[PDB]
Amino acid sequence: LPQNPNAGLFKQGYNSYSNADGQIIKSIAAIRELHQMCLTSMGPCGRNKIIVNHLGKIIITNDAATMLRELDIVHPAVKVLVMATEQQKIDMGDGTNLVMILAGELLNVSEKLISMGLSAVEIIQGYNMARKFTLKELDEMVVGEITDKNDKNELLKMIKPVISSKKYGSEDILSELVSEAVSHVLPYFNVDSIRVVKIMGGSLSNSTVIKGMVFNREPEGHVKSLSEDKKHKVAVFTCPLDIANTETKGTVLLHNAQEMLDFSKGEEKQIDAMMKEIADMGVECIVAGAGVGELALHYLNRYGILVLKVPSKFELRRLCRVCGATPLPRLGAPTPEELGLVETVKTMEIGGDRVTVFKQEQGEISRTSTIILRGATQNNLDDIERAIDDGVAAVKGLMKPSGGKLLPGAGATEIELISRITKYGERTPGLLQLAIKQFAVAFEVVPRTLAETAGLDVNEVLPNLYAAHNVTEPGAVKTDHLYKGVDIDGESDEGVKDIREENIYDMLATKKFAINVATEAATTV
Amino acid sequence: AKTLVDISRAQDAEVGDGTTSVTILAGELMKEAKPFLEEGISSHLIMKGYRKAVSLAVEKINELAVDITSELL
Amino acid sequence: VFMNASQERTTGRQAQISNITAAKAVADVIRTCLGPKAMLKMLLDPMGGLVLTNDGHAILREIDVAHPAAKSMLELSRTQDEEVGDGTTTVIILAGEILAQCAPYLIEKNIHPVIIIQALKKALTDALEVIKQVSKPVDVENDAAMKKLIQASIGTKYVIHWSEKMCELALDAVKTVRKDLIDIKRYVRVEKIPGGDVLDSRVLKGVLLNKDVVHPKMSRHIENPRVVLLDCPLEYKKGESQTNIEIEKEEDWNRILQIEEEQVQLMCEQILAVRPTLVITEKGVSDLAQHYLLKGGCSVLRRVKKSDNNRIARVTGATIVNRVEDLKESDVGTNCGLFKVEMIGDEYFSFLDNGSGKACTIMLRGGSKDILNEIDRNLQDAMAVARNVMLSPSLSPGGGATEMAVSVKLAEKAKQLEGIQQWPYQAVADAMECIPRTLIQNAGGDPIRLLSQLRAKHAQGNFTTGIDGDKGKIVDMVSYGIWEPEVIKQQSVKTAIESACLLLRVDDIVSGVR
Amino acid sequence: SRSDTLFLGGEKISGDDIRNQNVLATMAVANVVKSSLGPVGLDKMLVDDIGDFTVTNDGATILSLLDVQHPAGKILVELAQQQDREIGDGTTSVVIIASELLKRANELVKNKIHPTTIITGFRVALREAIRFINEVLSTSVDTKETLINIAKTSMSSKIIGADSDFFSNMVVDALLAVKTQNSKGEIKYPVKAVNVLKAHGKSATESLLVPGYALNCTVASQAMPKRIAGGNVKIACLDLNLQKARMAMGVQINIDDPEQLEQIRKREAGIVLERVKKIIDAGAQVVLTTKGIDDLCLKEFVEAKIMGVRRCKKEDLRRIARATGATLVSSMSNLEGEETFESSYLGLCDEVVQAKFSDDECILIKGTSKHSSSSIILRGANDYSLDEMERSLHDSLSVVKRTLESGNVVPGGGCVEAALNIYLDNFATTVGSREQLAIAEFAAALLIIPKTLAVNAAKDSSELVAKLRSYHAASQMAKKRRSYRNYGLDLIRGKIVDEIHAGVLEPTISKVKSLKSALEACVAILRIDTMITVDPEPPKEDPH
Ligand SMILES: Nc1ncnc2c1ncn2[C@@H]1O[C@@H](COP(=O)(O)OP(=O)(O)O)[C@@H](O)[C@H]1O
Ligand SMILES: Nc1ncnc2c1ncn2[C@@H]1O[C@@H](COP(=O)(O)OP(=O)(O)O)[C@H](O)[C@H]1O
Ligand code: BEF
Ligand code: BEF
């Protein structure tokens, strides 16, 4: 016996349709799933969640743009707000959480507006007209004196909040190393040069910053290498140190005895010839970047010359920018206008590992520096380099004028905005009023999210901040380490301005895409 | 979902007309009462808070009252 | 619908407790090995692992734990052997015990990790001070300060019965390199010989190695010899690049032949003009290569292990020279007092005795192939405790002493600092007794009476008083030869706790698929 | 290895592993219902793996639906259902105390304490603990006013908590007002309670108590009156099964020569009706059988306008007849020779009206000769709730009974469990040595409950409990009153408050029977070090 409903309109294999309103209710929740997971991650007094790669590797972070980096999602809608955080971490270092936090919330609050009666087009224009007002209003809500960049004074003041956010409790010591490695780059400046090298052993507090990069490698030439010098002049070059090998087809042919009896010698000749030539130039150290020849290595060890094995093509550069020399293909023909002086090239060992270094400069002073991070856990030492790269990106923005404009972070601004955005919609006729009063309360995230982190009764923290519009700066925030509501001004806690603007935009941009789509046709397999 | 579909017949027997409505109300009653759960202190503060609701509401539901003759029915 | 099917998630108190109580596992296993009444373990990984090393790292490596909050211990340990040799086992003890004593608050709470985390974060750096207060270099300063710091280490290992020998054994080799006032911890060489015994381990004051041969007519031994570190192949190794010899004419072949012969014939003679007694190279010469040098009375060498030959020049002062035709006369090594070939076990070692030489090679003999290795790893934990005993003449009064002392300090501070920070302060404080706990439980002497009477005394004085089961009861480990290098006790706490918080910094755990 | 015996399917764990597996198995069944207790606590839903659900906050019933795998867990389930027998409430909590006692006990032998020492450390701390109850419960003998408080405290941490005050009296009044018996010179309230039903649909608050029983039945024939009220009604609880009559078995019927098969066919029915009338002739306002009336014997009870109920609940007609003064008749014959019936068998009520309650109708019996009849007819949204509402009833009615059957009551709310915490450790530690550390844990294990009463609230409550400490410790020590102690937890609003000043109050009995059995369970498992578990009987699976 029957029955069975036929299929209205067929298609290929299998495809998934989604009625737009239903999808919005349904996909607005998918989005909401990764929200409650990103809430607890943002801010210092929060939490970090472990993640096990599809390859088995273990990863722990506070950063939400990385949580998703290691996360394999399926939801085409969630895919968006993930593309957001990720499409920001690259352009701007910090602020990756305020992305998701807002984005998610924007969608969350928009629901009410979508259910009330509004339409997606109406909701979009609503939010949009707020993104233009929230971006500008902030351009003046600053009041934070755009401090000029010099030494470690202004740096440590900014670089701390960027760090104290996830690696809370080591804010002071941490950022110290950051600003340290920074001030070794004579001020347009490149962020990439400051590389980081972490090595197991001891507690993190025993880390150090050396003017120059560190190599987890031993000096070639065996027991014939010095591995210890004083103020030696170096000369780095790519071309293989060994004999001049035929890049194209090439071999060795001999016809008569005289040929053979001498061919063996000829090599020895050229070898020593090439070497001594470069040695006489006063070259105290040859940093091989590509290829090493034992045949001719015979020479270099005897006079008393170092030899750093062939690093990566990309690591030779950042190295050279430390020495002062310059790379040069082909062996021989050294140019003193291409030579560089290196302070010390000793062979120290941390955690019992043979290592060579460029630490300290009398001296010429390196243009690139590296941080040596000692630790006890592979995982932590990794989510420390992150809290560092965040910082290295904060100094990347302050270095490009006039982004060096401070701003009341710690929720302060993210709270004042609540009212400032309300007024706009409070005095704008039309149905768009609602769509604005929502975008406003959307910023309830940062406030509450901080409170809920510390066990603070959220029902008190919010009201307190509202009363404290003080407008002193503000001047008004919440520190998990006190009573009631804290004062941003005091702690010297302020989040860089431009980062917030980027966050407030990328979210309002992404949240709009999710709102904009009506039907999703997902495939299979 | 099995508790809701139960209120349907749970209501139909008692009066027998509020079939479609009781479900539509019961449901939406939680949707606009949800964000007060997490943001709200507890699930029990909301309980007591609902009594003062049904009490008052039943009152207002009595204000708009009409008398049946017992033709005009 | 997300999330992808399927990958496990523990949100809530789950991961919060099922990670600490899960880390406790591996931390519950090793918690028996430590101190005088030690409990060495054996384990068979895939294939016949058959390895029995008491090195807490060596142990936690074989468990190959898969749990995140557990692989943290197999990591918090792995580090130890990088900074400080010994103590590898004791870290985990606390590393976990901390996690352990964090459960009570965390459960009756209503208390976020962040609170507990920083709560210990203070106590930790607080204890780090008290330690830096106790070490004193050096009251009765003597070259024996290191020697007795090793008898504190080797003690309660698979060598303790025969230890006073393996004590002077370690020290000697350590003091052969210029690390005094910097020098690697590799140069001492640990060799493995089949048969024998712990007691029959030789401390070669030079070099050691075996090699392939082609003719034994060579002289087996030479007194105060001349050693050339050649590094070449002489048989007739083909040229690097495609080497070919195209020919013309009837009577040329032989010319090429006698030429080839000549080419090598010369090189060989070149060695002679150096007046050596034993040619040691890193590559292969077989056949005529040996023959001639043997006629001259020189034991030819097959290429000598890479790290092998790199010991020989330093001991002999020679310098390895890959070139033969420019061999100077000041590149050879004669430091060898007596070089023989005394056969041992089923093998035959070439020992270069004698010294002014850095690599104090040790040819360690054993009775079982699974024990020779348990002794090796039983000196890596020593030679390093020696190395650090030199680098920092600051010595911690170990033996569960530095712990019982730190506790009183932390316990002292916590009372004045009352509040929700008092408990977590009295945490690392109490949990600091983790060591003296099973340190005695392993032995047998009552622990509870011992610490209830150890605290009751150590509290009113006896700042450096540990539990010495030599006579039962407890006394100042400062008097007896109980000395643990500073770095060990210090660095360990900072490390054991580093994870004792990381595993609390955990919200949930999300997995994957294969 | 081994050889030992015997595998497979038969194995055994030893010392540590067991003492652990036992503790884990206990925290398991424990930690599930560790959220339930306390006003701040919630309810749960259990799935009949066939869709069917069941929402409940009761700890006992909740653990039953779990399935209790393992000896240690099921041991707690067994300890649970014990509590209902003692009391009726606290099942959710007793399990916790026990579990915590093991948890700690083992955490001591894990410190090489040895069980014997511990098993005594409780053995004593328990006796002294009750010796402290002698100071707390006594003052709670004098304090209908405080009976509605106990019935109300049995509402919180429950669904009917929202309507506590309302149902608080519906509970008290039926037992207090209409539910008293007397057997062998003893006065007690129904430990088998008073009929309670459920009305599908309708208002929450509007659950109708009844001035009489509520026999759940429908009128035999539609032709019968749906109600017979007024006053002095003729009730008859007849378990005669007056339906029909068939030959007495073994008494075959072989006829001849007649022609008389009919002369007795009707005679088979006659003797039936003859008894039916003999009873109808004494009153017959309402007839209530257990076996049931027959169509050919209803017409007779119908024409006389006598309400007849086919096949009632035997457990009812008893309780009903006991109140109306009637006499649940078994067999017709009364001595010999007797038919029989006497108007002295019938009952005395006021109204016998068959009411209606949403697509359903039950006959009520209002008013009685002896004024002891109560039936609470609940009414809510779904069966899913109307049932659980009854659980809060069966679990609250009890708290009162136990109370009114023992003058001594106790300041609950974490109060008692707090005083003991401080009192034994501060004052029990006279023996000292090792035995001290045992007693200690026994006291510490008591905080387990006050703790969870707080942790149930998402907010940081680590402090709210810390205060309950200092406060209670204040009664004596340290370093003419007015006694500043006797306070308790106000889960509803943070911070301490005197519990006696509040409706909160738990029967002393409950605080004892639960404190005591929680120990025996713990002990019994402490003594365990090896669990030999032999496989059952496998299927033949014979290759031949
Ligand atoms: N004392 C503080 N120092 C630094 N940040 C603080 C401090 N107090 C609160 N915060 C929070 O830390 C910042 C945000 O946390 P973060 O994890 O960096 O989010 P995001 O990097 O995506 O912007 C602040 O703007 C604020 O909300
Ligand atoms: N004479 C001693 N009496 C009691 N305990 C000792 C004595 N000497 C050493 N110990 C204990 O053993 C050492 C700890 O080593 P441990 O980390 O447990 O394993 P291992 O010695 O193999 O590294 C300490 O010195 C101390 O806790
Ligand atoms: F959360 Be931010 F990106 F540090
Ligand atoms: F085993 Be020890 F701690 F190295």
Exposure letters D118-135 (e unless 16+ CB within 10 A, then b) = bbebbebbbebbeebbee
Cβ-defined contact of A252 to C244 (cutoff 8 Å): yes
H or E segment and range at residue A253: strand A252-253
Residue C424 CA to ligand 3 centre (angstroms): 29
Q: Are A356 and A215 in contact (CB under 8 A)?
A: yes
Pocket of ligand 2 contains residue C441 by CB under 6 Å: no
Only one residue has tokens 């030789």, namely C202
Q: Is residue D543 part of a domain?
A: no
Residues D134 and D148 in one domain: no
d(CA D1, CA D12): 14
D242 to D246, D272, D287, D329, D354: CA distances (angstroms): 12, 7, 10, 12, 22
Cβ-defined contact of A448 to B39 (cutoff 8 Å): yes
In angstroms, what separates the C-alpha of B25 from chain A's closest C-alpha? Answer: 15
Cβ-defined contact of D462 to C105 (cutoff 8 Å): yes
Q: Is residue D93 part of a domain?
A: yes
Q: Is residue D544 part of a domain?
A: no
Q: Is residue D324 part of a domain?
A: yes
Residues D218 and D272 in one domain: yes
C187 to C175, C307, C365: CA distances (angstroms): 11, 9, 19
What is the sign of the dihedral through the CA atoms of C98, C99, C100 and C105? positive
In angstroms, what separates the C-alpha of C470 from chain A's closest C-alpha? Answer: 32
Domain C-terminal end among D322, D351, D371: D371
A198 touches chain B (CB under 8 A): no
Q: Are C417 and C14 in contact (CB under 8 A)?
A: no
Contacts of D51 in chain B (CB under 8 A): 2
d(CA A476, CA A478): 7
What's phi and psi for C195, nearest 5 deg? Answer: -65, 170
Q: Provide the token pair at D87.
A: 């009391």
What's phi and psi for D233, nearest 5 deg? Answer: -100, 150
Q: Where are the alpha helices (DSSP H) in C30-112?
A: 56-62, 68-71, 73-76, 80-83, 88-107
| Best CA proximity match to C441, nearest among C98, C42, C35, C27 | C35
With CA atoms as reference, the chain C residue closest to D467 would be: C419
Only one residue has tokens 């206008």, namely A337
3-state secondary structure of D212: strand
| Best CA proximity match to C115, nearest among A456, A206, A449 | A456
Residues D513 and D523 in one domain: yes
Considering only the beta carbons, identify the residue of B7, B43, B44 that sits closest to D381. Answer: B7
H or E segment and range at residue C413: helix C401-416
Peptide linkage before C6 cis (omega within 30 of 0):
yes
| Best CA proximity match to A417, nearest among A515, A510, A507 | A507
d(CA C125, CA C117): 13
d(CA C12, CA A36): 12
Q: Provide the token pair at C270.
A: 């070149």
Give Cβ neighbours of residue C509 (< 8 Å, ≥ 6 apart): A49, A50, A51, A52, C8, C9, C10, C15, C19, C68
Examine the residue annotation and report whether C90 is marked as an active-site residue of this protein. no
What's phi and psi for D497, nearest 5 deg? Answer: -155, 140
Give C72's Cβ-side CA count (13 Å radius). Answer: 33
CATH code for the domain in which residue D82 is found: 1.10.560.10
SS (H, E, C) D345-356: CCCCEEEEEEEE
SS (H, E, C) D394-445: HHHHHHHHHHHCCCCEECCCCCHHHHHHHHHHHHHCCCCCCHHHHHHHHHHH
Domain C-terminal end among D407, D431, D464: D407
Residue A252 CA to ligand 4 centre (angstroms): 59
In angstroms, what separates the C-alpha of B61 from chain A's closest C-alpha? Answer: 24
With CA atoms as reference, the chain B residue closest to A445 would be: B39
d(CA A418, CA A440): 5
With CA atoms as reference, the chain C residue closest to D460 would be: C110
Q: Is residue D542 part of a domain?
A: no
Q: Which atom of ligand 3 is nearest to the CA of A390?
A: 4
CA angle A338–A339–A345, rounded 5-degree value: 145
Amino acid at site A298: H
Amino acid at site A146: I
Mutate to test the interface with D, among A452, A453, A457, A480 (most CBs of D within 10 A): A457
Q: Whose CA is nearest to atom 21 of ligand 1?
A: A95
What homologous superfamily does CATH list for A212-363?
GroEL (3.50.7.10)
Q: Are D468 and D490 in contact (CB under 8 A)?
A: no
What's phi and psi for D185, nearest 5 deg? Answer: 65, 40
D541: left (phi over 0), alpha (psi -120 to 50) or beta: left
3-state secondary structure of C377: helix
Q: Is residue D192 part of a domain?
A: yes
Question: Residue D322: which domain range?
Answer: 211-371
Exposure letters A263-298 (e unless 16+ CB within 10 A, then b) = bbeebbeebbebbeebbeeebbbbbbbbebbebbbb
| Best CA proximity match to C98, nearest among C498, C497, C465 | C497
d(CA D389, CA D380): 9
CATH code for the domain in which residue D151 is found: 3.30.260.10
| Best CA proximity match to C289, nearest among C384, C211, C360 | C211
d(CA D37, CA C121): 35
Residues D205 and D221 in one domain: no
| Best CA proximity match to C152, nearest among C381, C341, C394, C464 | C381
Residues D415 and D525 in one domain: yes
Q: Provide the token pair at B1.
A: 């979902």
Q: Which DSSP letter does residue C4 get?
A: P
d(CA A233, CA A155): 33
What's phi and psi for D425, nearest 5 deg? Answer: -65, -45
Q: Which atom of ligand 2 is nearest to the CA of C86?
A: 23
Pocket of ligand 2 contains residue C30 by CB under 6 Å: no
Give Cβ neighbours of residue A337 (< 8 Å, ≥ 6 apart): none
- Total domains in chain D come to 3
3-state secondary structure of A356: strand
Residues D147 and D135 in one domain: no
SS (H, E, C) B7-64: HHHHHHCCCCCCHHHHHHHHHHHHHCCCHHHHCCCCCCHHHHHHHHHHHHHHHHHHHC
Mutate to test the interface with D, among C37, C97, C108 (most CBs of D within 10 A): C108
Q: Provide the token pair at D79.
A: 């300890």
- DSSP structure string for C212-276: --S-TTS-S-EES--EEE-----S-PPPTTTEE----STTHHHHHHHHHHHHHHHHHHHHHTT--
Q: Are A361 and A211 in contact (CB under 8 A)?
A: yes
d(CA D48, CA D65): 9
Residue C503: burial class (beta carbons within 10 Å; 0-12, 13-18, 19+): buried
Residues D445 and D468 in one domain: yes
Neighbours of chain B (3+ CB pairs under 8 A): A, D
Q: Is residue D426 part of a domain?
A: yes
| Best CA proximity match to D159, nearest among D204, D101, D122, D127 | D204
Other CB atoms within a 10 A radius of the CB of residue C376 amount to 16
Amino acid at site D344: S
| Best CA proximity match to C385, nearest among C400, C395, C372 | C395
In angstroms, what separates the C-alpha of A99 from chain C's closest C-alpha? Answer: 20
Residue A46: burial class (beta carbons within 10 Å; 0-12, 13-18, 19+): buried
Q: Provide the token pair at A366.
A: 């390196």
Residue C320 CA to ligand 3 centre (angstroms): 55
Q: Which atom of ligand 4 is nearest to the CA of C90?
A: 3
d(CA D200, CA D216): 14
- Helices and strands (H and E) in chain A: how many: 17, 12
With CA atoms as reference, the chain A residue closest to B31 would be: A112
CA angle A348–A350–A353, rounded 5-degree value: 85
C162 to C159, C169, C227, C336, C375: CA distances (angstroms): 5, 11, 36, 30, 11
Contacts of A451 in chain B (CB under 8 A): none
d(CA D165, CA A51): 50
Strand intervals (E) in D239-347: 286-289, 307-309
Contacts of D455 in chain A (CB under 8 A): none
Amino acid at site A24: I
| Best CA proximity match to A380, nearest among A89, A95, A58, A38 | A58
Cβ-defined contact of D454 to C110 (cutoff 8 Å): yes
Residue C106 CA to ligand 3 centre (angstroms): 27
d(CA C361, CA C205): 7
How many residues in chain B? 73
Instruction: Find residue D368's DSSP bridge partners.
Output: D349
Instruction: Find residue D14's DSSP bridge partners.
Output: D530
Residues D382 and D459 in one domain: no
Residues D203 and D216 in one domain: no
Q: Are D37 and D96 in contact (CB under 8 A)?
A: yes
- Proportion of chain D in helix, strand, coil states, percent, rounded to 5: 45, 15, 45
Cα torsion at D118, D123, D124, D130 (round to 10°)?
140
Q: Which DSSP letter does residue D97 get?
A: H
Touching A: B residues 34-63, CB under 8 Å: 39, 41
Examine the residue annotation and report whether C88 is marked as an active-site residue of this protein. yes
Instruction: Find residue C362's DSSP bridge partners.
Output: C190
Residue A355 CA to ligand 4 centre (angstroms): 26
Residue C90 CA to ligand 4 centre (angstroms): 6
Q: Provide the token pair at C330.
A: 């000041």
Q: Provide the token pair at C250.
A: 């009837």
3-state secondary structure of A389: helix
Cβ-defined contact of A301 to C319 (cutoff 8 Å): yes
In angstroms, what separates the C-alpha of D148 from chain A's closest C-alpha? Answer: 34
Give Cβ neighbours of residue D183 (< 8 Å, ≥ 6 apart): none
Q: Which atom of ligand 3 is nearest to the CA of A162?
A: 4
Q: Which CATH architecture has domain A146-211+364-404?
A: 2-Layer Sandwich (3.30)
Peptide linkage before D340 cis (omega within 30 of 0):
yes
CA angle D371–D377–D380, rounded 5-degree value: 160
What's phi and psi for A218, nearest 5 deg? Answer: -100, 150
Give Cβ neighbours of residue C265 (< 8 Å, ≥ 6 apart): none
Q: Are A274 and A334 in contact (CB under 8 A)?
A: no
Instruction: Find residue A288's DSSP bridge partners.
Output: A237
Contacts of B31 in chain A (CB under 8 A): 115
Q: Provide the token pair at A399.
A: 């270095």
Domain C-terminal end among D355, D371, D387: D371
Residues D110 and D163 in one domain: no
d(CA C275, CA C297): 11
Mutate to test the interface with B, among D40, D382, D490 (most CBs of B within 10 A): D382
Determined by: X-ray
d(CA A20, CA D145): 60
β-pair type (D187-188, D181-182): antiparallel
Residues D71 and D145 in one domain: no
Q: Provide the token pair at A221.
A: 């030439």
Q: Which of C89, C277, C316, C361 is catalytic?
A: C89
Largest alpha-carbon pair distance within chain B?
Answer: 54
d(CA A375, CA C79): 8
How many residues in chain D? 544
Residues D215 and D361 in one domain: yes
D228: left (phi over 0), alpha (psi -120 to 50) or beta: beta
Q: What ligand is nearest to the CA atom of residue A45?
A: 1
In angstroms, what separates the C-alpha of D460 from chain A's closest C-alpha? Answer: 6
Q: Provide the token pair at A131.
A: 């993104």
Q: Is residue D323 part of a domain?
A: yes
Domain A1-145+405-525 class, CATH top level: mainly alpha
Instruction: Find residue D366's DSSP bridge partners.
Output: D212, D351
Give Cβ neighbours of residue C451 (< 8 Å, ≥ 6 apart): C404, C433, C436, C437, C440, C467
Mutate to test the interface with B, among D40, D49, D453 (most CBs of B within 10 A): D40
Note the Cα D89 to chain centre separation in Å. 8
Considering only the beta carbons, identify the residue of C109, C112, C441 that sits closest to D112. Answer: C441
Q: What ligand is nearest to the CA atom of residue A496?
A: 1
d(CA C74, CA D119): 38
Helix axes of C401-416 and C486-502: crossing angle, nearest 10 degrees: 50
d(CA D196, CA D393): 9
d(CA A277, CA A305): 13
Examine the residue annotation and report whether C89 is marked as an active-site residue of this protein. yes
Q: Provide the token pair at D504.
A: 């909160």
Cα torsion at C416, C420, C425, C430 (round to 10°)?
110
Other CB atoms within a 10 A radius of the CB of residue A142 amount to 15
d(CA D236, CA D307): 10
